[PDB]
């Protein structure tokens, strides 16, 4: 138990954040995953860089009714992930609005990371893998990695490369 981390995970409704959450901690997938009804922990302690680092994942809801509830955690969130889908450009075309929820409340050390969900059928994706790289035009924090919770593809390097760069941002 060296440090406890405060990553948040935000994104649209039914995109797969609650899917992508447990695939990293409980390693369990389920197509019939119930949408989260608020904020929710998921504890995890990973030893890295000579330090057993604790991790608090805060899966937010995404629905309009639960916009104000989740707002109290961004000002204490250390890292910040944004997850978005591929069939639904509408799940992409509100990322400045999500950024509007980011920029109004995020702190200085919020290292953004975008992630396309469900990369199994990217040929039918409404969004190109380069469009997010075309969306990567934001500040130096913003990164990108397409992935898939179903195929369990790169789900660690989502969190790991983030928390590595977070601990890299740590002195």
């Amino acid at each position: 138990a060296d440090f406890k981390l405060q990553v948040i995970i935000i994104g649209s409704r039914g995109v797969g954040k609650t899917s992508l959450m447990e695939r990293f901690t409980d390693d369990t997938f389920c197509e019939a995953c119930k949408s989260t009804v608020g904020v929710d922990f998921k504890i995890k302690t990973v030893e890295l860089r000579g330090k057993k680092i604790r991790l608090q994942i805060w899966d937010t809801a995404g629905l309009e009714r639960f916009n104000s509830i989740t707002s109290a955690y961004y000002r204490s969130a250390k890292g910040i992930i944004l997850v978005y889908d591929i069939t639904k450009k509408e799940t992409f075309d509100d990322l400045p609005k999500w950024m509007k929820m980011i920029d109004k409340y995020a702190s200085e050390d919020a290292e953004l990371l975008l992630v396309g969900n469900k990369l199994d059928c990217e040929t039918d994706r409404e969004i190109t893998r380069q469009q997010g790289e075309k969306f990567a035009q934001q500040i130096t924090g913003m990164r990108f990695c397409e992935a898939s919770a179903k195929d369990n593809f790169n789900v660690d390097e989502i969190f790991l490369k983030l928390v590595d760069d977070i601990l890299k941002k740590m002195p």
Binding site: A1, M21, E22, T25, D26, V37, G38, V39, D40, F41, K42, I43, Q56, I57, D59, I69, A72
Partner: protein, 476 residues
Amino acid sequence: SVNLSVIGLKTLDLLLTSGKITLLILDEESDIFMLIFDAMHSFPANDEVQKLGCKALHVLFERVSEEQLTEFVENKDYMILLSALTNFKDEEEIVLHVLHCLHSLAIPCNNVEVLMSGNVRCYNIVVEAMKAFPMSERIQEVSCCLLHRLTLGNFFNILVLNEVHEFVVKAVQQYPENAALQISALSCLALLTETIFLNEDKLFWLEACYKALTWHRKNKHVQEAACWALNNLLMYQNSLHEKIGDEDGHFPAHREVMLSMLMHSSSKEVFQASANALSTLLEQNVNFRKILLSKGIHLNVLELMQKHIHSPEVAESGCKMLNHLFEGSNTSLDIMAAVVPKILTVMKRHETSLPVQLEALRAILHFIEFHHKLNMVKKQCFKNDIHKLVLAALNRFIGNPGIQKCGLKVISSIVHFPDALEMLSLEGAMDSVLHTLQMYPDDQEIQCLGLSLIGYLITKKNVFIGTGHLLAKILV
């Protein structure tokens, strides 16, 4: 030994109740907890292997550690919770002990967030409180004590899961005699009332809290919790201010809060809670702020501040209660004459906290032949040295603009006493007004209030040549 381990557990279940063999059992090379866990892992699906074993952990978890307790959430809690709740969702003794041991290990803060996580979810407590006991006292008492223990800074999980902010209320209204149930439930409800009213229902807390105020009269803890929950209810749902009162159909809760303040006088905590309770009572009523005045409660709260003189919280609350009490009360001269040096003693005893002087300054304003009476009144008043207290207070707090208005109002009021240009010139006041004027130039209210004071504190000593340049610049 599926038939000889059960009797060994039965011997243990009878042995552990004696106590002081327990520490000898811990002081061993057995790892007795690991023995019990290996046993329960070895023998699932067995009432006697499960129930007697949990009754054991029930008393055994009371004295282990803080860190092995903090260690145990690795996978140990997993065995108990999972097997018992899931395997035995109808075995009342088992869920009772399962809630009991979980409540016992719910002590360390590093365990609570594990208990409120996504994998380990402490809302099986709700499933128990609904299903396994709709009519059992022991299960409800233990579960509600657990839920009160769970309330760390993660309130927006417990409250948002509406099966907690409601089920606790039904638990309160069900059993109105269990005192431990009261001091857990009302504390939990006072900690959750803000977040649950960020989202009739307000009728629920009030009747239960009133009956709890009346019935468990002799106990202190239940009435600290009661006055706390009532205060924190009415200060967030103003619509049922009208639902109480000495009139018919109402609750005369103010009488009960006054009585509870009078009873447990020796405890500062209950007086703190009762003072905030009476404050928020008076804050939205005008009939109440004459009866307690006629009931002499001001002398009593003065006595209580004279008792707990070395404690700033109750001083803050006593001045705050005086504030809402005298909010629009005509007064004879004898009142303020007796009162004031007690309050200045309260301030010079706690001459460090902004709020204990915020509310006190907000209260003291109300008081400021009959002329001879006023003469001796103000003379003894400056003998109690109001002026040093307030001027050094503004000196102490360049911030806190509320006192930076009100204490100025007080001084401008006091300057109509013949000692002022003698004693405000035997102590000095004008430079503080100047430093605050440049501190608060933009505030129109502070500017206009302090400007007459500027005109009331300039003598030939202060307007001596060279010293008027700052005054000239600040006036223009």
